[PDB]
């Protein structure tokens, strides 16, 4: 993984097993440091035969890749969201901590705008941004140009560091979920498909088109729907266990795909 | 991944930075459902930083492998394991919850040691086995002969699939903790060290060629002390985060390894 970028879709029946709410936000939050650790560009959730939960794992995910100081003006943190106080730090370069420095990018979201052109939040003071017509209440991308009373940023992107995640919340099954974001290459990952052990050095291949890849999971119990993938594969092969929840298999699978993309 | 028995080595400072005893005790569960998923032999809790919970790492991983036809009678109420009802579940080979049966394996609790023999708590009712040094009070395993009222067991434990892991809960630190438990093999985790990626087939090589292996995880503010081991390795190469915890370190560097040690 160092450019190969990653999409990975996850049914919103995820946490329908979990009674406790405190444990089911943890649960969606592994998901959230599992897509971070290995740099995942994009989260998919997709609408599965069941009922569920889309509503609260996008909240969740989302809440996690929101810088700190920007989670409390974009969240009501009502009920759904009461034990989002337990989900652990997500140490990325979107989540810069102290205050401002020269130079440096981070994420703001657009408050007021003004004359002298837009308002917004980068975690110091309401910092000011010159391109006058910056749509309020976004989270965008800024680099910080000079410091001072009131601080002065230029909307900017990183290219050269991870960025975190966007997440699809399509409400729509699988395959038109799939059928948006598109990507050349899409591997489902299935308990009943061949070993990645052995098709190994084909998914090292694959892989290496290198555009942006769309990794499928399905839960323990139904699989993946009637679909097209390029690839379909077992990447925990020889499990000792009944079950692989899907926290687990997404975390498995992305560290597994992490060494064959060099 | 066979006929490379794995330990895994982690420190018992991995539950330090959560207030929260209920995510305390469900993260120290994820240990336990990685290393049951890749068929983990064992587990040792090893010293590390000031403080520890190295007795409620070891009490939690044990509350989960042994079976739950034991678990009421096996563990007093302690306070620290009440949240104990939102572990995950974990179906082994170990853990049948289907009524006892001819030829089938389960782990029984010894009980008493009575004039014909012994009387161990199988699965459902009370059966017994024949020996009499068996230990009193001591868990172990037993494959059902014949059933009835007084089915009998002898002790067996299966080696053609997974049975679970043991809990080492070594009072030393790692070096100390290496020497306690041998392994032909000693593979060390790092950022630092040089990724799976590059010694790939070397590391294959000396998997394979496995007879006992040990990972080495250690925290995710430290990472390890100057062991001496057989590997150095960095699993995770190219992480995007500052951190990685020794919970996702154990699940993602396991399937890592799963997928070198399989066999043709």
């Given at each position: 993984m160092n450019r190969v970028d990653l999409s990975l879709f996850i049914p919103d029946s995820l946490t329908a097993e979990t009674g406790d709410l405190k444990i089911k936000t943890y649960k969606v939050v592994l998901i959230a440091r599992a897509?971070?650790?290995?740099?995942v560009k994009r989260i998919v959730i997709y609408h599965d035969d069941a009922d569920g939960e889309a509503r609260f794992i996008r909240d969740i995910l989302t809440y996690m890749d929101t810088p700190q100081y920007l989670r409390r003006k974009v969240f009501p943190i009502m009920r759904e969201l009461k034990h989002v106080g337990i989900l652990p730090p997500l140490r990325t370069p979107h989540h810069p901590?102290?205050?401002?420095?020269?130079?440096e990018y981070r994420q703001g979201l657009t408050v007021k705008r003004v004359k002298k052109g837009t308002l917004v939040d980068i975690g110091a003071d309401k910092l000011a941004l010159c391109?006058?017509?910056?749509?309020?209440?976004?989270?965008?991308?800024?680099?910080?140009?000079?410091?001072?009373?009131?601080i002065l940023?230029?909307?900017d992107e990183p290219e050269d560091r991870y960025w975190g995640?966007?997440?699809?919340?399509?409400?729509?099954?699988?395959?038109e979920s799939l059928k948006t974001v598109g990507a050349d290459v899409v591997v489902a990952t299935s308990r009943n498909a061949?070993?990645?052990?052995?098709?190994?050095?084909?998914?090292?291949?694959?892989?290496?088109?290198?555009?942006?890849?769309?990794?499928?999971?399905?839960?323990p119990y139904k699989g993946?729907?009637?679909?097209?993938?390029?690839?379909?594969?077992?990447?925990?092969?020889?499990?000792?266990?009944?079950?692989?929840?899907?926290?687990?298999?997404?975390?498995?699978?992305?560290?597994?795909?992490?060494?064959?993309?060099?």
């Open positions: 897509a971070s650790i290995f740099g901590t102290g205050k401002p420095v020269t130079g391109r006058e017509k910056l749509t309020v209440n976004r989270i965008m991308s800024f680099r910080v140009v000079r410091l001072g009373k009131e940023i230029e909307p995640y966007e997440v699809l919340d399509t409400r729509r099954n699988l395959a061949s070993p990645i052990t052995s098709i190994l050095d084909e998914v090292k291949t694959r892989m290496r088109g290198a555009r942006e890849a769309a990794i499928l999971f399905g839960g993946l729907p009637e679909i097209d993938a390029d690839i379909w594969v077992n990447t925990l092969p020889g499990q000792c266990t009944e079950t692989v929840r899907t926290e687990e298999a997404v975390l498995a699978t992305l560290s597994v795909f992490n060494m064959l993309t060099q």
